[PDB]
Structure formats: C-alpha cells, structure tokens
Amino acid sequence: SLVKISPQVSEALSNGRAVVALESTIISHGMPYPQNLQTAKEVESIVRENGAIPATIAILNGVPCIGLSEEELERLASLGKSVQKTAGRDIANVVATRGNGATTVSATLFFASMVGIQVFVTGGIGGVHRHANHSMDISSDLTALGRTPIAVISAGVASILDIPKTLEYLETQEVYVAAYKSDEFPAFFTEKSGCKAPSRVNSPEDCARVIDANMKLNRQAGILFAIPIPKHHSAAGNLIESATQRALTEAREQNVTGNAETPFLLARVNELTGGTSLAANIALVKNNALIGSQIAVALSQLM
Amino acid sequence: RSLVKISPQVSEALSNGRAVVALESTIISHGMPYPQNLQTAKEVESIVRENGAIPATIAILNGVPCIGLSEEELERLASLGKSVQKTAGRDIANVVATRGNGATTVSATLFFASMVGIQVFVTGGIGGVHRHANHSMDISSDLTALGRTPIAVISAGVASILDIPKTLEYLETQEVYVAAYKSDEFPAFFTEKSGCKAPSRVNSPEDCARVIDANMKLNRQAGILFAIPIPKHHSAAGNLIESATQRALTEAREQNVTGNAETPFLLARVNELTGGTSLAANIALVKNNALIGSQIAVALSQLM
Amino acid sequence: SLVKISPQVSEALSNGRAVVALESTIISHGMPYPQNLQTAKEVESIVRENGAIPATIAILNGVPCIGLSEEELERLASLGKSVQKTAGRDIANVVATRGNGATTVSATLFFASMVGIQVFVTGGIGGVHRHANHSMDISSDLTALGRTPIAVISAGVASILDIPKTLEYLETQEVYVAAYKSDEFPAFFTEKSGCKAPSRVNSPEDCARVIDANMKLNRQAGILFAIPIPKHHSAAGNLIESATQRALTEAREQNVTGNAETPFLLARVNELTGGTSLAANIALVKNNALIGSQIAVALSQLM
Ligand SMILES: O=c1[nH]cc([C@@H]2O[C@H](COP(=O)(O)O)[C@@H](O)[C@H]2O)c(=O)[nH]1
Ligand SMILES: O=c1[nH]cc([C@@H]2O[C@H](COP(=O)(O)O)[C@@H](O)[C@H]2O)c(=O)[nH]1
Numbered sequence: 031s032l033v034k035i036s037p038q039v040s041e042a043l044s045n046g047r048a049v050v051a052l053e054s055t056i057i058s059h060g061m062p063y064p065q066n067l068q069t070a071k072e073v074e075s076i077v078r079e080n081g082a083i084p085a086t087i088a089i090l091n092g093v094p095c096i097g098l099s100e101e102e103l104e105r106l107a108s109l110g111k112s113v114q115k116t117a118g119r120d121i122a123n124v125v126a127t128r129g130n131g132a133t134t135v136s137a138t139l140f141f142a143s144m145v146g147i148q149v150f151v152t153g154g155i156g157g158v159h160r161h162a163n164h165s166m167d168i169s170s171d172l173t174a175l176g177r178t179p180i181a182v183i184s185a186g187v188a189s190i191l192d193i194p195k196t197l198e199y200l201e202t203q204e205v206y207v208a209a210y211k212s213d214e215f216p217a218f219f220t221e222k223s224g225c226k227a228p229s230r231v232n233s234p235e236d237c238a239r240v241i242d243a244n245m246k247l248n249r250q251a252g253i254l255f256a257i258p259i260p261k262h263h264s265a266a267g268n269l270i271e272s273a274t275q276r277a278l279t280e281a282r283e284q285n286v287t288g289n290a291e292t293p294f295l296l297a298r299v300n301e302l303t304g305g306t307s308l309a310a311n312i313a314l315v316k317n318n319a320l321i322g323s324q325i326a327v328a329l330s331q332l333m
Numbered sequence: 334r335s336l337v338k339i340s341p342q343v344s345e346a347l348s349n350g351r352a353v354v355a356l357e358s359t360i361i362s363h364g365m366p367y368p369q370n371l372q373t374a375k376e377v378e379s380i381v382r383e384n385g386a387i388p389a390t391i392a393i394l395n396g397v398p399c400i401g402l403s404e405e406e407l408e409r410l411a412s413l414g415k416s417v418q419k420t421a422g423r424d425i426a427n428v429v430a431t432r433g434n435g436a437t438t439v440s441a442t443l444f445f446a447s448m449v450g451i452q453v454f455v456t457g458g459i460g461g462v463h464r465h466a467n468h469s470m471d472i473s474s475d476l477t478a479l480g481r482t483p484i485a486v487i488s489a490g491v492a493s494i495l496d497i498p499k500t501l502e503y504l505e506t507q508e509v510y511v512a513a514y515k516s517d518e519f520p521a522f523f524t525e526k527s528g529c530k531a532p533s534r535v536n537s538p539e540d541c542a543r544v545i546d547a548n549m550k551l552n553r554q555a556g557i558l559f560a561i562p563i564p565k566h567h568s569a570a571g572n573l574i575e576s577a578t579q580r581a582l583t584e585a586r587e588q589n590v591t592g593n594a595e596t597p598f599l600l601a602r603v604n605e606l607t608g609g610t611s612l613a614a615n616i617a618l619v620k621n622n623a624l625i626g627s628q629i630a631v632a633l634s635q636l637m
Numbered sequence: 638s639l640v641k642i643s644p645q646v647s648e649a650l651s652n653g654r655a656v657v658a659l660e661s662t663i664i665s666h667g668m669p670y671p672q673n674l675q676t677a678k679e680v681e682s683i684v685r686e687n688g689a690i691p692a693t694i695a696i697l698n699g700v701p702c703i704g705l706s707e708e709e710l711e712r713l714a715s716l717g718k719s720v721q722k723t724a725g726r727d728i729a730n731v732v733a734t735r736g737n738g739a740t741t742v743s744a745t746l747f748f749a750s751m752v753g754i755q756v757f758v759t760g761g762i763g764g765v766h767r768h769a770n771h772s773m774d775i776s777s778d779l780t781a782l783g784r785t786p787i788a789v790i791s792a793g794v795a796s797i798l799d800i801p802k803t804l805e806y807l808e809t810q811e812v813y814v815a816a817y818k819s820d821e822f823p824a825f826f827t828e829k830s831g832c833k834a835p836s837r838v839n840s841p842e843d844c845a846r847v848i849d850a851n852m853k854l855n856r857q858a859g860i861l862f863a864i865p866i867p868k869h870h871s872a873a874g875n876l877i878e879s880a881t882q883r884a885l886t887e888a889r890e891q892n893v894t895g896n897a898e899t900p901f902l903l904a905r906v907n908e909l910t911g912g913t914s915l916a917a918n919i920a921l922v923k924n925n926a927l928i929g930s931q932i933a934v935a936l937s938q939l940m
C-alpha cells in the first residue's frame with residue numbers, strides 16, 4: 031500500500047526463500063559516487079552468489095522501497111550525500127515531505143521486520159558513544175533491536191563507540207549477542223576489541239537455529255551476530271585508535287552532534303588512515319554479506 | 334469501555350473522525366495556582382473549540398478514568414488542588430483501584446488518549462532528564478511513554494529546570510521524532526532559547542499533520558514531539574529566568590524539597606523570583622500550544 | 638506449541654484458578670543438592686497450602702517448561718549449578734542448543750506472561766548495579782518488567798545493587814512499585830533500605846485490585862510488589878553491609894563482570910556471613926510465596 035516491494039523480493043518472501051535486508055546509509059553517507067554504487071552492487075552480488083535475494087531498503091520520493099531496481103540504486107547512489115540520513119524516527123518525515131532517504135540500521139530494521147525479512151546484513155551497528163554519561167548519546171539502533179525480532183549481521187561495533195557500554199546496553203535491552211567463531215567480541219575495523227563475547231556461535235546453521243527459536247517463541251527482541259573481520263583484512267589497532275581519538279576531538283570542537291556524528295567520524299578516520307579504514311569497512315561488509323546470506327539460506331531450509 | 338468514561342462530545346467526535354485534542358490535568362492540579370489554573374484550563378478548551386477541534390481533558394475522578402471533562406468536573410478538579418494524586422502512567426492502576434482522584438501527567442494522558450484513538454495531545458512542557466541524572470538516574474517516564482506510544486505531543490519544548498541536551502539525546506534513543514516549529518532552535522518552555530539546535534523543523538500545521546498521518550499509515554509504535562517556541566512577545570527571556578531557575582534549584586536542594594513536591598516548589602519559587610512573569614509566560618505558551626495543536630488536529634482530520 | 642505446560646497448571650489456567658509462577662535459579666544457583674530440592678518442594682507446598690497452583694518455570698533439554706513435575710524438579714535439582722543462568726535474551730539460544738536453563742526474572746516473566754499467569758513470586762529482582770554510571774550495568778529484569786504486564790512479588794532489592802537508582806529506573810520504565818504494609822522500601826535481606834517506598838499496599842486484596850485494574854486497562858507494563866522480610870528473619874544491616882562491602886571489593890579485584898556478578902556477590906556474602914544471608918534469602922522467598930499466593934487467590938476471586 032505505502033511500501034513498494036520489488037518483484038524479486040516479493041516472490042522470495044511468498045515462497046519462503048532466503049532474503050537479506052541491506053541498509054542504504056552506507057551508500058549515501060559511507061563513500062563517494064560511483065564507488066558507493068560499485069560497493070553496493072558487489073555486496074548484492076555476494077548475497078545472490080550465496081543463494082539469497084538482496085533487499086536494499088531506501089526511501090525514494092517519499093516511497094519506502096524494499097528491494098531496489100538497478101535504476102533506483104543508480105539514482106540513489108548518484109544523489110550522494112544530498113540524500114537524508116534516515117533513522118527510524120525520521121521515516122515519517124521523509125515520507126511526508128516526499129523526500130529521498132537512506133535508511134540507517136534502526137530504520138532498515140523497521141521495514142525489514144514489517145515485511146517478514148529475518149536477516150539484516152550491515153557493516154557495524156550504532157552504539158553507546160564515548161562519554162555518554164556526559165551526553166546520553168546512544169544510538170536508536172540499540173533500542174530498535176531491543177524491540178524488533180530480526181537478526182542483525184554485523185562485524186561488531188566500531189571503536190569510535192564505547193564497546194563495553196554498548197554490550198551492557200544490549201544486555202539490558204534483552205538483545206542476544208554472539209560472536210562468530212570466536213570468544214572475543216570483534217571491533218569492526220579490527221578483529222579484536224578487548225572484550226569477551228557474551229556468547230558464541232560456530233556456524234551459519236547454529237545462527238539459523240537461534241533465529242528459528244526466536245521466531246517460534248514470538249519474542250519481540252532481536253539478535254546481534256558479530257562476525258570478526260577476516261584476519262588478513264583487519265586494520266592495525268594502533269593506527270585506528272590514534273585516528274579515532276583525533277577524530278573524536280575534532281567532532282567535539284566543531285560541535286558535530288546528533289546524526290551527523292557517526293558519518294563525520296568515519297569519514298575523518300578514513301582520511302587520517304589514508305584509506306585503510308574504509309578498505310576494512312568494505313571488507314567486513316562483504317564478509318558479513320557472505321555469512322549473512324549463508325545464515326538466511328540455512329534459516330529458509332529450517333522453515 | 335465499561336471502565337473509561339468518554340464525554341458525549343468527545344465520544345461523538347471520535348465516532349465521526351472529528352479533530353480531537355487531548356489535554357492533561359496535572360497542569361490544573363499541580364502546575365499552576367488556583368485562580369489561574371482553572372482560568373487557563375477554560376481558556377485553553379475555548380481556544381481548541383474556536384479553532385475547530387474538540388478538547389478532551391483527561392483525569393481520573395473517584396477511580397473513573399474520564400476522557401473529556403464537563404465544566405463542573407474541571408471546576409471540581411481545580412479546587413481539589415494538590416489533594417489529587419499526581420498520576421503518571423505507572424500510577425493509573427493504583428488510583429483506579431483505590432477509587433481516588435488523579436490528575437494525569439503526560440505519560441498517563443498519552444496512555445488514555447492513545448487508547449481511544451486521539452492523535453494530538455497538547456501540553457505545556459514535557460518531563461525530561463533531570464539535572465545531575467548521572468548521579469540520580471532521575472528521568473521522566475514521559476520520554477519512555479512517548480517512545481512507545483504513537484501520538485503527537487505538542488509542547489513548548491523542555492524547561493531549563495531539566496537537562497535539555499540530555500533530554501533531546503534520550504528522545505532520539507527512544508526513536509521519538511522531535512521537530513521545532515518554524516525555528517532552527519529547540520525551545521525551552523518559558524523562553525525560546527535553549528542553546529540547542531532543533532533536530533528537525535516543521536513550518537506549518539499542515540506539515541505537522543502530514544508527518545502524523547505518515548506515522549499512522551506506517552503503524553510505527555513511537556510518537557512525535559512538536560516543540561512550539563513561545564511567541565516572542567510573551568517570552569520570559571528578558572526576566573532572568575535562567576538565574577531564577579538556578580536559584581530555585583539551589584534553594585530546593587537546601588530545603589530538602591524532593592519528589593512530587595519539587596516541581597511545584599520550583600514553579601512557585603521561580604514565579605516569586607520573577608514577579609509573576611514566569612507564570613504569565615507559562616499561561617501564554619499553553620494557549621499558543623493549544624492554538625497550533627488544534628490547527629494540527631484539524632488538518633489531520635481533513636487528511637483522514 | 639513449543640512451550641510445555643504441566644497438566645496441573647494448564648487445568649488451573651483453563652478454570653481461572655490462582656496460579657503463581659516461580660523461577661528456578663535459587664534451585665540451580667542458590668544452594669547444594671539435595672537440600673536444594675527439599676527447599677524447592679517447601680516453597681511449592683506453601684503455594685498449594687495457600688490455595689494456588691505453583692508453576693515453576695525452567696528450560697529442560699531445550700524445552701520451556703511452565704510447571705514442573707516431580708521428576709523434572711528432581712532432574713533440575715540434580716543438575717545443580719551446571720544449568721545455564723538464562724536471562725530473557727538467552728532463551729532462544731538455550732532452546733536452540735537443547736540446553737538446560739534456569740530462567741532469571743526477565744526470562745521467567747516472558748514465559749509466565751505468555752500463558753496468562755498474573756503473579757510471579759521471586760526473592761529479589763535485579764537492578765541498577767553500583768557504579769552503573771561508569772559501566773551501564775543494569776539488569777534486564779527492569780526493562781522486561783517495564784514491558785510485561787505481570788505482577789512480580791519480591792522482597793525488594795539487595796544492597797549489593799544501587800537501590801535508589803533502581804527505584805528511579807523502574808519509575809522511568811513505568812513500573813508501578815509498592816511496598817507491602819510499610820512506608821519504607823525493603824532491601825531483600827533486611828527490611829530497611831533507607832529509601833521511602835514510592836507507594837504502599839496493605840493487604841493481598843489491595844494488591845489484587847491493582848493487578849485487576851492493570852489488566853482491565855490493558856497496560857503493557859508490570860508491577861513490583863516489595864514485601865519486607867519478616868521482622869524476626871531480617872538480617873542486621875551492619876553485618877550484611879560489612880559482608881556486602883567486602884564482596885563488592887572482591888568482585889572488583891577479580892574483575893567479575895556481566896551475568897556472573899550477582900551470583901558471585903550473593904554466594905560470597907553467604908560465605909562471609911556464615912550462612913546467615915542464605916537463611917534470610919530462603920525466609921523471604923517463603924514469605925513471598927505466602928503473600929503472592931494470597932494475592933493470586935484474591936485476584937482469581939475478583940475475576
Ligand atoms: O560505516 C558505517 N557504519 C554505520 C553507519 C550507519 O550509522 C548508523 C548509526 O548512526 P546513529 O547512531 O546516528 O543513528 C548505523 O545504523 C548505520 O546505518 C554508516 O553510515 N556507515
Ligand atoms: O539469590 C538469588 N539468585 C538469583 C537471582 C537472579 O539474578 C537475576 C538478576 O541477574 P542479572 O541482572 O545479571 O540477569 C534475577 O532475575 C534473579 O533471577 C537473584 O536475584 N537472587
């Protein structure tokens with residue numbers, strides 16, 4: 031009615047075939063055009079190569095789109111950063127003003143769950159920002175996942191955020207958190223965060239069985255699977271931390287706040303590391319798409 | 334149903350899809366002194382009606398939740414004053430069970446308005462993150478209520494007695510859409526200037542109505558805060574409101590005024606300190622919220 | 638469906654008879670076998686003796702059980718601490734791995750509410766941890782009760798936690814909190830917390846009337862009734878505080894974190910008080926079962 035679902039996604043959902051939701055803010059605010067389009071195409075190709083149907087979610091001319099046509103992807107990507115970064119709380123406004131919106135994890139969660147997609151691949155999830163006891167700056171991603179029964183496939187949480195506090199917040203929100211094939215919770219750019227994972231899963235089939243259980247119980251809280259970036263693609267943790275500290279200070283000084291903050295910080299860290307962090311970001315999203323697609327296929331086979 | 338009493342005019346309005354504006358009752362019982370509390374409530378209901386909407390003041394009377402009050406009930410409530418229980422959402426069941434009188438806060442009024450399908454709720458200010466919440470965790474259930482109730486709250490922002498930046502952050506985490514009306518600055522109740530940028534902006538009642546309408550069609554289970562800056566000619570910005578507020582906060586700490594006694598103490602003391610100016614501003618902003626809120630409700634009714 | 642409800646509980650729910658939910662972690666994590674089984678039997682007997690059907694909740698071989706048979710209670714008791722401490726966010730995982738789980742307050746709430754049980758007797762509820770300002774360590778019991786319309790019967794909150802902040806957090810979550818026949822909020826082992834109770838109820842009938850109103854209103858938030866430990870069983874606040882202070886220091890030095898912290902502290906306080914604290918813990922659970930049952934019976938009669 032209000033939501034436009036692509037034929038291919040619509041067909042897969044009707045037949046119980048694997049579908050993987052994808053967000054669009056990485057396209058609009060994660061990298062420049064046409065690299066953004068290239069990375070988005072590659073991710074969707076990895077999803078299809080591993081047996082799932084990719085469902086990139088966005089809002090175009092006020093219409094929520096679940097699954098984008100090639101034309102729509104190209105159009106969105108070419109708009110670049112002029113597209114509105116759209117969290118869940120922004121959806122109604124972008125719809126009402128007939129605008130274009132690139133959806134974050136919290137908005138993408140909402141639409142994916144709405145149409146019955148169970149697996150959502152992202153790069154990293156928002157979290158508790160550093161010094162949140164002074165700011166209370168905490169991503170709506172965490173509350174959204176706490177009340178949306180969907181599995182988010184991430185590479186953990188970036189060190190621009192407070193990882194230990196983000197893990198505590200997720201526990202309080204009743205989100206099941208598990209690291210993939212590791213006892214150590216990953217830190218996005220780097221495989222190791224310094225925090226033990228609260229739980230562990232060792233295969234795509236293991237992940238699918240937890241999701242299946244969650245669905246059967248009708249629990250209204252979600253799941254975060256954290257897939258460590260492949261060791262060969264992991265960025266040096268001292269280079270990342272040094273760039274991160276500088277970026278955080280610059281954000282504070284230039285009064286970058288609210289939803290402008292994460293995009294500002296990730297872009298600055300990429301500048302400061304001469305491209306190394308963006309390259310790792312691209313690597314982990316591709317790895318997440320691979321594992322995420324395998325989970326969705328396993329889940330489809332269970333059901 | 335058998336427990337909630339809906340006034341005939343509100344009942345008819347809901348059945349026919351007419352514009353309805355919910356109103357809370359704690360501003361009457363605990364928010365303002367006895368002549369102005371009743372006078373203001375009557376003036377607000379009149380502004381709502383004059384602009385084409387039906388006012389639905391919500392309260393609990395002798396254990397009965399009432400949605401829409403008669404002039405007599407409004408009179409009865411204003412005079413009972415603070416003998417009525419200040420009733421947050423979490424207190425409703427208790428007040429009903431004990432057959433008490435309760436003046437409903439934003440969190441309680443939200444619950445009842447949403448229950449019967451009212452989409453627009455006009456208030457003065459919303460509760461928020463209290464100052465020093467890092468040592469207390471004192472945070473209004475208004476914020477959590479709005480985060481899980483699909484209704485639009487029309488306020489004049491957040492008072493500086495609270496921590497405005499942290500309140501804005503908390504609302505974002507709860508997925509509440511926040512927009513300032515015809516301004517880039519988030520307003521601060523008595524005064525238009527909070528020092529904080531508005532996270533979003535809307536420029537007409539019709540624009541507000543379109544956001545609410547989209548939110549309803551999407552079936553999102555989170556609400557909206559529209560923050561209407563107090564009209565420039567009624568602002569208390571010129572009256573040392575921030576100084577008076579700071580002095581009031583300090584005096585409350587020294588006299589151990591806490592809990593439900595605090596806000597009334599602070600409001601009375603700030604009014605003393607500003608020679609009546611802060612109360613006048615409070616009256617002005619609630620009336621302005623009623624005007625814009627009614628216009629939003631009417632535009633929404635027309636959309637639907 | 639997926640949940641196994643015992644015949645006695647099922648029959649009681651079908652007939653609108655009083656049912657009291659109970660958790661299993663004190664069996665699993667509170668004391669050694671076979672005394673642990675005898676205590677569990679004594680608590681269930683208090684429930685039956687006061688006119689209600691006890692519904693002990695646990696997960697056995699991946700199956701959620703609401704109401705345990707004699708054989709099932711024996712198996713749970715013999716597993717001892719080898720059972721997984723299962724919060725709400727752990728349920729899907731324990732189900733998926735076919736594990737045994739002792740459900741905490743947050744997990745037990747979910748299952749009791751699912752099948753229409755209105756009264757859940759516990760000992761104490763989890764809360765805001767001390768120094769939560771630097772850790773954000775806050776029990777999911779609080780968020781669970783804020784979105785589950787069920788009454789929890791507790792003896793308040795232990796002083797190992799931050800009681801004032803716990804009370805504030807509950808207000809924020811819209812949980813109605815009332816002390817039973819007292820103006821002072823109780824502190825688990827001890828009747829006095831130092832905090833005024835936010836509200837008060839003076840009989841099981843009063844409690845049932847609040848629950849009945851909450852049910853008729855269809856509010857989706859729960860209730861915490863805090864029943865002070867009987868005066869003759871109350872532990873002295875200075876022998877508790879001494880043990881408590883030492884236990885807290887030790888947990889900090891041994892870097893005990895996450896879901897291990899509360900079980901560590903309670904076990905250590907019990908060690909340091911030579912059994913006095915566990916004795917008080919058993920006394921308050923038995924008192925809670927008595928009052929809880931009377932409330933559940935009064936509620937059944939109202940309905
Ligand atoms: O490399 C990236 N990680 C994460 C984001 C986005 O940032 C959001 C968090 O932003 P905020 O907490 O302001 O809502 C996440 O949901 C995600 O969509 C992004 O654009 N690029
Ligand atoms: O003697 C006790 N044993 C176990 C608990 C459990 O601890 C939980 C809180 O721990 P956490 O916040 O870490 O989930 C409670 O739900 C309860 O089931 C308790 O409170 N008291």
Ligand SMILES: O=P(O)(O)OC[C@H]1O[C@@H](O)[C@H](O)[C@@H]1O
Nearest residue numbers: 421438460473474475596808
């Ligand atoms: O959760 P509650 O207690 O209702 O919110 C805190 C503040 O919200 C307002 O209504 C009151 O003035 C109170 O001080």
Ligand SMILES: [Mn+2]
Nearest residue numbers: 167168288289
């Ligand atoms: Mn933020």
Ligand SMILES: [Mn+2]
Nearest residue numbers: 471472473808
């Ligand atoms: Mn408060």
Ligand SMILES: [Mn+2]
Nearest residue numbers: 774775895896
């Ligand atoms: Mn914890």
